Amino acid sequence: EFLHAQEEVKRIQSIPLVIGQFLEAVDQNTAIVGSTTGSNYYVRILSTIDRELLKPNASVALHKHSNALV
Amino acid sequence: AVDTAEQVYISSLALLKMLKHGRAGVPMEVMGLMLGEFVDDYTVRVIDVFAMPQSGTGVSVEAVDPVFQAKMLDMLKQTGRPEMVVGWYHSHPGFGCWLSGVDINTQQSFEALSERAVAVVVDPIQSVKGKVVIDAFRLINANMMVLGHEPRQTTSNLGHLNKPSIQALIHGLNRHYYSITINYRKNELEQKMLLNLHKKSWMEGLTLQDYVVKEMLELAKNYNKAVEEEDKMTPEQLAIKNVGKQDPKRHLEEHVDVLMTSNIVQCLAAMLDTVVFK
Amino acid sequence: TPNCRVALRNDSYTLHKILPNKVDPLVSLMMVEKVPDSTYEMIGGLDKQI
Amino acid sequence: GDLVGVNKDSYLILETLPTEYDSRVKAMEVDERPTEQYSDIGGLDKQIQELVEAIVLPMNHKEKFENLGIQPPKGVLMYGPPGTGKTLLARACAAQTKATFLKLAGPQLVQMFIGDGAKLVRDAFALAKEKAPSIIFIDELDAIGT
Amino acid sequence: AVQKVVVHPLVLLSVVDHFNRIGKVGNQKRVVGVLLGSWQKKVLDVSNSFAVPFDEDDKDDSVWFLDHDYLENMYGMFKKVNARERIVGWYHTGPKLHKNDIAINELMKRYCPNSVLVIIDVKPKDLGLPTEAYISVEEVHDDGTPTSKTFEHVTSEIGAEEAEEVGVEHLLRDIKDTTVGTLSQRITNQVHGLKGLNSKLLDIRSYLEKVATGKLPINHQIIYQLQDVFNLLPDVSLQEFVKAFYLKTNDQMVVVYLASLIRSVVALHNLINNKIANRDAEKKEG
Numbered sequence A: 001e002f003l004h005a006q007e008e009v010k011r012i013q014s015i016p017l018v019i020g021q022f023l024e025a026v027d028q029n030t031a032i033v034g035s036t037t038g039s040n041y042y043v044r045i046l047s048t049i050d051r052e053l054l055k056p057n058a059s060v061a062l063h064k065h066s067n068a069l070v
Numbered sequence B: 001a002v003d004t005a006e007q008v009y010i011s012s013l014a015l016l017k018m019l020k021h022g023r024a025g026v027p028m029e030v031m032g033l034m035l036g037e038f039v040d041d042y043t044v045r046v047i048d049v050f051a052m053p054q055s056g057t058g059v060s061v062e063a064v065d066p067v068f069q070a071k072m073l074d075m076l077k078q079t080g081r082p083e084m085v086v087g088w089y090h091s092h093p094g095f096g097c098w099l100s101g102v103d104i105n106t107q108q109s110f111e112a113l114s115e116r117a118v119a120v121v122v123d124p125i126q127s128v129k130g131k132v133v134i135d136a137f138r139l140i141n142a143n144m145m146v147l148g149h150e151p152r153q154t155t156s157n158l159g160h161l162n163k164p165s166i167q168a169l170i171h172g173l174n175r176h177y178y179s180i181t182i183n184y185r186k187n188e189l190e191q192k193m194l195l196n197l198h199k200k201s202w203m204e205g206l207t208l209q210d211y212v213v214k215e216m217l218e219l220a221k222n223y224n225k226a227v228e229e230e231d232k233m234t235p236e237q238l239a240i241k242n243v244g245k246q247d248p249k250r251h252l253e254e255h256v257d258v259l260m261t262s263n264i265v266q267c268l269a270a271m272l273d274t275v276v277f278k
Numbered sequence C: 001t002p003n004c005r006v007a008l009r010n011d012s013y014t015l016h017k018i019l020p021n022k023v024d025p026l027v028s029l030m031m032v033e034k035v036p037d038s039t040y041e042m043i044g045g046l047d048k049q050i
Numbered sequence D: 001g002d003l004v005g006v007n008k009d010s011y012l013i014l015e016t017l018p019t020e021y022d023s024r025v026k027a028m029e030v031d032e033r034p035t036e037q038y039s040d041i042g043g044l045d046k047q048i049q050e051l052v053e054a055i056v057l058p059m060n061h062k063e064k065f066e067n068l069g070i071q072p073p074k075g076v077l078m079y080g081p082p083g084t085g086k087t088l089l090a091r092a093c094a095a096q097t098k099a100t101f102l103k104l105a106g107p108q109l110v111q112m113f114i115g116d117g118a119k120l121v122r123d124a125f126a127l128a129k130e131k132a133p134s135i136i137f138i139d140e141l142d143a144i145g146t
Numbered sequence E: 001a002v003q004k005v006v007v008h009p010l011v012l013l014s015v016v017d018h019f020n021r022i023g024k025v026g027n028q029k030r031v032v033g034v035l036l037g038s039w040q041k042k043v044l045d046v047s048n049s050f051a052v053p054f055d056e057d058d059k060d061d062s063v064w065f066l067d068h069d070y071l072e073n074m075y076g077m078f079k080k081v082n083a084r085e086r087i088v089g090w091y092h093t094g095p096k097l098h099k100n101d102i103a104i105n106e107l108m109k110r111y112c113p114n115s116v117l118v119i120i121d122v123k124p125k126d127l128g129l130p131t132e133a134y135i136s137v138e139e140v141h142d143d144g145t146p147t148s149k150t151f152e153h154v155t156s157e158i159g160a161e162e163a164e165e166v167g168v169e170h171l172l173r174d175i176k177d178t179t180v181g182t183l184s185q186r187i188t189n190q191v192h193g194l195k196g197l198n199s200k201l202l203d204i205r206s207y208l209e210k211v212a213t214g215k216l217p218i219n220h221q222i223i224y225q226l227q228d229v230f231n232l233l234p235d236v237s238l239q240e241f242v243k244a245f246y247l248k249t250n251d252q253m254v255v256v257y258l259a260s261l262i263r264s265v266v267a268l269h270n271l272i273n274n275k276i277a278n279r280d281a282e283k284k285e286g
């Protein structure tokens, strides 16, 4: 059931996505990301990779409605 | 006077045209009609759902053609079951499927026609497979603000449906509305073949059909070797030494268990030599 | 504090956390462009003037 | 083209609708006819004939021009130390000739936003092709021509 | 024309829910309706449909009637809501086809150039991917019969769509997905011998029955032809692998080598790191 829960988090959000610009890592489990439109968004990061691909400034894909960091 | 919490029995056939007719209107919102039978106050069943013409100019109460239903009910008589109409439904794919400004204007009109006229919403976007999603609601009369405003008895079927409470604007419509419980009366006859038709079509088509050799293992060895040193530098990174670096950090996953299953893929696929042949 | 960066929720549009901002780093970065550090060990010959 | 109507997000165009655009750019000024006539100038009868000719001759006398190969004048430079009664005499000649008058000034073509008065002639002379004279009168051409 | 068809679980249910409609009132025959196809290409797809009252007499085995007032105006209904959806043919639950089925398709060819019939199954039993599909053509015959109209089998496959897996795949909830790479491929292997060699025995007994009785089918010739394509390797005694013998283990060469190489270092990752973190907590606590 936990391995089935691994398919859950990998299912979200699937498609589609929107590009966004990462600004800085404020704390654990969440970080702020500027949208392509320019509005900075504060989004809970995905529980898988919190560190190595974060980077101070990078372009990170976001979900349409939720703008989720993946 | 006496109002009891309603239970909605939906048929697996009625579930089809909810998402299917809703998919045809995507992205735009549609307007449907619910078909079923009223058994009593505390339970209700929807035995059928049919498609209604989608409105490209926006949903209105006049989008439902009365001669469309009058010609449909006559075609339902020659059909096996001619059951009376009950209520309406509408898709809302573009957002979190909440009752809009038109949905409340078509409420007092439909609740005058039929007693309950349960408001049902559905959205494709929230998930794909393992979530009910959809939505449902029932208008609680604003004229009742003089009387007791907190139905219903037999609470938590609402109260539990009141979880998660689904953000704010959704439950912001809990003023003048109350949702309704959706459970599935067993179709399992059809639901058993629903699993059999789905998994058999997904099992190698015959189970036979499906049942870069050393090179796929030469590409895998780059994941089974060249990935090792970037994985096995981390224990030397765990050696500080010692100790100025912030700990603990666990690099054991996920490559170790992936290369495990990577052999599980390659070993049983190589067993096809011993399995298929002899 | 004013001018400070803050997170914003979607629904109630409130501030979820407090975030460190940069105002002095803007200026000070332009200040470090024009000159290096240049301490006493980086200066000499002016001892009469120092 | 442009200007056509289309319904909300359905994106269907029912009919192709004219004409052009926009607001005061389409019609600079709407003038019916002045309260005065060309008879209001004394002693200028010598130099009004040159004026009255160039405007009147392309209308009534056009049939005689195709026979003799005559080309009517277009622009006319009317200048004198003020008051010369130039603007009263100009517009007054459009009253008896039924010519529709359009009021325009040179400095009126300058706005904050660049590319306004320049796009106006694209609209103005397009109406000069669409419409028949009538007439168009402007003032302070010397300053704007600097 | 029509090569393969795509049958959704939604439209197939539209035949199944009508089995509850006329199943309670009975009596004879089966469920029959007209099929609404979605044709974007040579591959055929089906989204929705409408079930029509239908009956087929026994005596009187050639008697059949669709209700065409139900077919006409209800088409303008589904056409108004869905412009792409149109009738590509008809369907029924079978299980088999009586000879009268020749006349159902030829009547509705005014609606569609070629009407594809779909035989479905309301109760899943055997042997595999269910239902069936036929196409109406005329092959005449080699023996010289008058022009013979016989429905040729069309391969049927299930397919999915967006937003339709919401309620469908939810209600099961009991399936384990999958798991790809361990059990998924091996259960098929146990079945690939079962389902592979059972039809082997069922047909080889009917092919022996040919000489006995039931001749024709002669067939001819399709039976032995592709059987001889199966004969590229028989494989019979013994396996004729003298050229494939050293190659047999040579395909297992690197698969065993990597399995030996990965488990060595995976252990070094599992064994070392476990001992480290264990004694750090264990002995430093007490």
Ligand SMILES: Nc1ncnc2c1ncn2[C@@H]1O[C@H](COP(=O)(O)OP(=O)(O)OP(=O)(O)O)[C@@H](O)[C@H]1O
Binding pocket: D040, D041, D042, D044, D082, D083, D084, D085, D086, D087, D088, D139
């Ligand atoms: N030579 C003239 N003939 C007739 N009227 C005149 C003459 N000179 C001046 N006037 C009178 O003086 C008044 C002032 O008009 P004025 O000549 O100042 O306009 P204008 O200078 O031509 O305008 P603009 O500067 O826009 O060209 C007019 O009402 C006009 O009747």
Ligand SMILES: [Zn+2]
Binding pocket: B029, B059, B090, B100, B102, B103
């Ligand atoms: Zn609506």
